[PDB]
Design a protein around this ligand. Sequence first.
Ligand SMILES: [NH3+]c1ncnc2c1ncn2[C@@H]1O[C@@H]2CO[P@@](=O)(S)O[C@H]3[C@@H](F)[C@H](n4cnc5c([NH3+])ncnc54)O[C@@H]3COP(=O)(O)O[C@H]2[C@H]1F
Lengths: 171, 171
Amino acid sequence: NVAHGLAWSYYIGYLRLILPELQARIRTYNQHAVSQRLYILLPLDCGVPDNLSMADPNIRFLDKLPQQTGDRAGIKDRVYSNSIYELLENGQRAGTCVLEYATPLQTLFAMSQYSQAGFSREDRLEQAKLFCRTLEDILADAPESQNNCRLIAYQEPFSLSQEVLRHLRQE
Amino acid sequence: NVAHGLAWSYYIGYLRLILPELQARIRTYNQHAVSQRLYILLPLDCGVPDNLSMADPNIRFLDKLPQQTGDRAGIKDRVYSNSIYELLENGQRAGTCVLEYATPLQTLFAMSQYSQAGFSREDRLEQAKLFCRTLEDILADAPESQNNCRLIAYQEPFSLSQEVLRHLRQE
Ligand SMILES: [NH3+]c1ncnc2c1ncn2[C@@H]1O[C@@H]2CO[P@@](=O)(S)O[C@H]3[C@@H](F)[C@H](n4cnc5c([NH3+])ncnc54)O[C@@H]3COP(=O)(O)O[C@H]2[C@H]1F
């Protein structure tokens, strides 16, 4: 049950901190049109690339949001930065969103390759589902999540841009 | 055993990334004298303040290291920043180090206060020791730790500056 602690740390040390300030940062970039929610990609195979634009030709990096800084555990001005992506459909700009992967899923992957971690590669999908399940239960009861965060969990046997656009059109 | 996953994520998603580049960043600040190792404070009571200078009058913030950036899980130029601190002894500058707290210990604390986390406040010291024990076993076998990281675990029943200075004088 390693994913339980990673999901609670993903909320306490990130979502609880950036989500209350996400609406003000998006409004600052819009004025001085990006959508209002932070869209988190949760691949249940834990295949998390670092270049999201290289994972889908229809997902294109656009710009960065205004940075969020704060003193965190003795580190002065710890930077919390997020990227804005454009989603294409038949060569048409179909949406603009703050998009990123669920980083602890990447840690879950590399943890399975370290023999000292005691985490078999077979349990990767099991813990990925537990991570999404735990995070869903936290955000459903979290006051910081006020229609400003959307979890996008999927299982690739496929268009990643189409999956993001379906959640984008629900708003 | 929540601390097991937090310690492995503290290494995979941080120490493995910044320690290979820490020597070059310290040499850049020195030329264009800070010590060579990253000193991590691990309070076993998990009492981690955000203002380290406010936790000890003999620990004084000095400057920031050159920032380390990198594309991480769809986030372009994720910033990894570290702070340089000065340690005083009888009003004398006794040492200069890159000092910070073990952030997952702070997450371990807040996790004990959330009722949905299923983590009792009594198990805080137990998991703090497991976190330090797990991290010690990782760094002892990690190739990225080449005499560039020093764990400072302590139990306050006391001078935090004196504890850091004792490890500082060992080098
Ligand atoms: N720059 C820097 N400074 C100091 N310390 C660091 C550090 N980077 C890593 N660490 C240490 O390694 C742990 C695991 O990091 P990891 O990356 S695998 O997972 C994170 C991540 F998914 C999400 N998250 C938090 N901040 C985030 C930002 N800015 N962007 C995107 N996602 C973020 O929340 C998880 C828990 O973050 P945490 O702070 O509680 O624990 C961290 C921290 F203790």
